[PDB]
Design a protein around this ligand. Structure first.
Ligand SMILES: O=P([O-])(O)O
Ligand SMILES: O=P([O-])(O)O
Lengths: 184, 184
């Protein structure tokens, strides 16, 4: 009757193999029906929203099990996760949402806006690591091999002309190089 | 005049994304001319040597920079690394070999057969991690994002019907499934 859907949030600037492993392992190990990669809005701070989404589409293109949730992108401003999750549950009242975060983030949970309303609204899912676990917050946990790739390391490897093969999907690399992204 | 060639050793049972990232990052970050993946001989202990090599070929197929060193496979018995490295340097007296090992292995270096003859014979390359580094052994170090994938975890995920997507290359997964490997 009700669907089980994971949500993985991030800047995805760019998407890299750590996002895919995290999203596929979390969702498949728990038995979820799908995982959505949910890019956050980033203000002109002076790439583009289209390039991040293009890259994210190329990345999950051959995988019916991973998909793109664009609601935060479409809002044209910063969002609190409560407001995002309030509208998505209102849109999909038949969905149990599983909101996936890394073991290294469960500490800052009390610093989330309306974190209390939010935990009643979604199922929080932690990625085990070394932190122990043992959180007073209603988190369930799942094992993911840890992949120490972040999108800020990818951009400066690119900025410095270092290899990113295997760290970032072949198509995504290809899009980056053929669009001049992150060069400077 | 002389070539710089990395060597990465392992069972590769099966090859998985941790091998590729390790071999590409080590070799490219140091500026080496190539890295060789060097599968060790495994005795009938009662898969096959052909399946491990087939998988390894499929894995580096689209990458001129990573290649397969089969000398240990062809010997039909266990080898000490000194004997391997003695014959390969005799074969290729124009090559400076860089023998890549993980930061987590540098401890057991004194337990290698003729480790002394061997350090004079190759350049040892460690993958930084958390161990500090600081080894009395003549190791140079290079940074690789850590990828906590091992081939024994892959086989039991397979044995237990768990997802290995993104952990193991698409072609390799495909070979495994279409050859009945690691099922039981
Ligand atoms: O895109 P990030 O926030 O997961 O690095
Ligand atoms: O193949 P392994 O020895 O690197 O796990």
């Amino acid at each position: 009757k009700k669907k089980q859907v994971g949500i993985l949030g991030g800047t995805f600037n760019p998407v890299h193999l750590a996002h895919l492993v995290m999203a596929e392992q979390a969702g498949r190990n728990l038995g979820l029906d799908r995982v959505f990669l949910m890019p956050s809005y980033q203000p002109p701070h002076v790439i583009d929203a289209k390039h991040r989404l293009n890259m994210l589409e190329l990345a999950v293109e051959d995988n019916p099990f991973l998909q793109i949730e664009t609601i935060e992108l479409a809002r044209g401003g910063k969002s609190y996760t409560y407001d995002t999750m309030k509208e998505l549950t209102q849109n999909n009242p038949d969905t149990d949402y599983y909101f996936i975060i890394g073991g290294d983030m469960v500490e800052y949970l009390p610093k989330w806006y309306k974190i209390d309303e939010l935990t009643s609204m979604v199922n929080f899912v932690g990625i085990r690591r070394g932190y122990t676990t043992d959180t007073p917050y209603p988190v369930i946990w799942v094992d993911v091999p840890e992949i120490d790739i972040s999108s800020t390391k990818i951009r400066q490897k690119i900025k410095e002309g270092c290899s990113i093969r295997y760290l970032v999907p072949d198509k995504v690399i290809d899009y980056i190089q053929n669009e001049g992204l992150y060069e400077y």
